[PDB]
Amino acid sequence: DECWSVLEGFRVTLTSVIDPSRITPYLRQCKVLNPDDEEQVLSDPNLVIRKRKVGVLLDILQRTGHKGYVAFLESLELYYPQLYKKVT
């Protein structure tokens, strides 16, 4: 691992800003997630504030390592450039 245990250093910022409906497909084509986990992220009558969703998604990525990390990171510097800069 060695990467998530540090990126997590700041998580409130992400959980507040980022949104899933854009990140999901690019990841999907970089072959990380499966359909089921996506539908669990999005359609669920229990978690609604939009923040629990990001929490679940970010944890599902943490369960995977370097690969999913790179996918997430590249997606991020492609969509949210100033946030990527803040990360680095």
Annotated binding-site residues for Zn(2+) read: 3, 66
Of 2, 21, 85, 88, the residue at the interface with a second copy (CB under 8 A) is 21
Distance CA 31, CA 50 (A): 24
Binds a second copy (CB under 8 A): choice among 33, 51, 76, 87? 51
Least separation in angstroms between residue 87's CB and a second copy is: 14
16 binds a second copy (CB under 8 A): yes
Pick the binder of a second copy from 2, 45, 85, 88 (CB under 8 A): 45
**All residues at 6 or more sequence positions from 5 whose CB lies less than 8 Å from its CB, including other chains:** none
Q: Which residues are annotated as part of the binding site? A: 3, 66
- Tell whether residue 36 is a contact of a second copy (CB under 8 A): yes
